[PDB]
């Protein structure tokens, strides 16, 4: 199916002394493959998946250099943005950046993105066409003009349609054994009673990859959303994901209710019953 490469960067200013805390992570699909943390000892980009370890010392030198450049742009940005917004030196502030590319089942370019936030709000983002910018306010509008003059969009577009896609394909091939494998959810159902009239049914999906999944209840063959609780998809910690959906039902009527599970690792949707 489709695939992505995405990088996520957070910098948090430390007012009293020194440079900001900087954390960078890279993902292929739902798999983290690299990291840099400014508070760690190595001051190098670090592997987080075995297949990226195939890369040679030049890759690690080149990635380290770039990630440090990312860090310094963020450092400068925090000062510029404090200036744009007339803020003091006392408070802590945050910049967040995410960029990357999508490819479809054919591994051809589908979509590219580059978005930027200050204190948890939209600041500026590259538009879908990769030719123009969305600036949320007048501070971001000043950045937009700066970036138009410097032809920033043009450089980003070349990366997003070129290098990004080229290297995602490369990672997908080298990590084929896990990255191109689907892990179907392991499903089961639990039952609890609150009183002698009311029961809770919980439909579980465990150990699945990719993260994307749909879990729903039906009652007598029709979609049931009232009296349901659906939790956020959560990491198991071993690379796979978990989720559940519960429904409250009258004791004795459990049989009317079916759980339905859709996942790319399942050629057909699965049905569970109590």
């Amino acid at each position: 199916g489709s695939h992505s490469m995405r990088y996520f960067f957070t910098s948090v200013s430390r007012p009293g002394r020194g440079e900001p805390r900087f954390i960078a992570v890279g993902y292929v699909d739902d798999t983290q493959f690299v990291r840099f943390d400014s508070d760690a000892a190595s001051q190098r980009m670090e592997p987080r998946a075995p297949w990226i370890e195939q890369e040679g010392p030049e890759y690690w030198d080149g990635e380290t250099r770039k990630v440090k450049a990312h860090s310094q742009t963020h450092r400068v940005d925090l000062g510029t943005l404090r200036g744009y917004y007339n803020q003091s030196e006392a408070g802590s502030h945050t910049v967040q950046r995410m960029y990357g590319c999508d490819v479809g089942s054919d591994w051809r370019f589908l979509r590219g993105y580059h978005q930027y936030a200050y204190d948890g709000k939209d600041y500026i983002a590259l538009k879908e066409d990769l030719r123009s910018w969305t600036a949320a306010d007048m501070a971001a509008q000043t950045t937009k003009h700066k970036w138009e003059a410097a032809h920033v969009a043009e450089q980003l577009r070349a990366y997003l349609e070129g290098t990004c896609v080229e290297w995602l394909r490369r990672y997908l091939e080298n990590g084929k054994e896990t990255l191109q494998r689907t892990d179907a959810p392991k499903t089961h159902m639990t039952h609890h009673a609150v009183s002698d009239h009311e029961a809770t049914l919980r439909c579980w999906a465990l150990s699945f990859y990719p993260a994307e999944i749909t879990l729903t209840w039906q009652r007598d063959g029709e979609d049931q959303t009232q009296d349901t609780e659906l939790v956020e998809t959560r990491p198991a910690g071993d690379g796979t994901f978990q989720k559940w959906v519960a429904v409250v039902v009258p004791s004795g009527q459990e049989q009317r209710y079916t759980c339905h599970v859709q996942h790319e690792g399942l050629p057909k949707p699965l049905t569970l019953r109590w």
């Binding site: 992570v25 987080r48 945050t94 204190d119 948890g120």
Partner: protein, 100 residues
């Protein structure tokens, strides 16, 4: 400043069985700013050997972290996750419920 309170889930990595080693997870998400305190508790006492994921965030810019530790469940031990954040007046405690 925008301020968003963390959602908390506490759970094991693998289906939980007494005498069988496993990982206790506390997943915190949907929060802003990034500063947060997360402890795993065994019978009300802070567990010392606790690791966490690298800070990342969702589309809406909110942060998420997974805190985890190795543990062997028993019938008698009770586990919980204690979270403090700027949005919280008192630390929030969520108990691990293995029967869920």
């Amino acid at each position: 400043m925008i301020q968003r309170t963390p959602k908390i889930q506490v759970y094991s990595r693998h289906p939980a069985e007494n005498g069988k080693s496993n990982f206790l997870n506390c997943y915190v998400s949907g929060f802003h700013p990034s500063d947060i305190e997360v402890d795993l508790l065994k019978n009300g006492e802070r567990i010392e050997k606790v690791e966490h994921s690298d800070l990342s965030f969702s589309k809406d810019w909110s942060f998420y972290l997974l805190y985890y530790t190795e543990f062997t469940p028993t019938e008698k031990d009770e586990y919980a996750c204690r979270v403090n954040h700027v949005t919280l007046s008192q630390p929030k405690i969520v108990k691990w419920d293995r029967d869920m």
